[PDB]
Each structure stands twice: as structure tokens, then as C-alpha cells.
């Protein structure tokens, strides 16, 4: 599923991602955008053989299982394919443990390289939520 970007902001704060750990509506949708299109269906596979999956992007090499990933953990306890499902539930369990790993919303590379320190309210401007 794609969703409409104020769409995804309604879905993501109904989930509670609403300023979780100090990050505002815009820096999840902002990192959203720019990770996936806003594309649950969303995979990309990375250089040393792990795969990013879902809205965000979540990688296999520590937050969930994918059955190819050598010597990876599971820390979200899922298989990846439920990052790709319609309902983001998954997707937000899993990003709100990953932001409380210690480097904050810097765990997402786009995230630090292109949402972090901009004008992220820009992305929810217009909203019902």
C-alpha cells in the first residue's frame, strides 16, 4: 500500500509515534518519505547481504527475520514480511524500539541526511489529525 502522505501522519500518530522519544509527527513522516515512498511493499537489499523492509526501512541484520540474513539477530521478534503489510503496526513496534537503541532517529541514515534539522513540520502542514 502507498499512502498519502497526511494519510501515513494519521496512521503514525494513532500509533502513538506522535512526538515518541522527542520526535515530532514530521521527522517520521519526513524519514518515511524518503525511505520508502511511503510504500509498505518497500525492500532494498544492502551491500553486506541484509534487506530494509516496510515504510522505514527496517533492517534484517538486527530487528526481524527473514530466514537470509547469516548471523543476524530478531529484536523486533517478526518476520520481515510483516513489515511490507497495509497496517503499519508492525512497522511502528519495531521503529519505536529502534529509536530507543541510543542514537535516536540517526539510526535511520536518510533521516540524519535529509530530514534532520529541516523544517519537518512541513510534512504534516494541512493535516486533519
Request: aromatic share 10%; proline share 2%.
Amino acid at each position: 500500500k502507498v499512502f498519502g502522505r497526511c494519510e501515513l501522519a494519521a496512521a503514525m500518530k494513532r500509533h502513538g509515534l506522535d512526538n515518541y522519544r522527542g520526535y515530532s509527527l514530521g521527522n517520521w513522516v519526513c524519514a518515511a518519505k524518503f525511505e520508502s515512498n511511503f510504500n509498505t511493499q518497500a525492500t532494498n537489499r544492502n551491500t553486506d547481504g541484509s534487506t530494509d523492509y516496510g515504510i522505514l526501512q527496517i533492517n534484517s541484520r538486527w530487528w526481524c527475520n527473514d530466514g537470509r540474513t547469516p548471523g543476524s539477530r530478531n529484536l523486533c521478534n517478526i518476520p520481515c514480511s510483516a513489515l511490507l503489510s497495509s497496517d503499519i503496526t508492525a512497522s511502528v513496534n519495531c521503529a519505536k524500539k529502534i529509536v530507543s537503541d541510543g542514537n535516536g532517529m540517526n539510526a535511520w541514515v536518510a533521516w540524519r541526511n535529509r530530514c534532520k534539522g529541516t523544517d519537518v513540520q512541513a510534512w504534516i502542514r494541512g493535516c486533519r489529525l
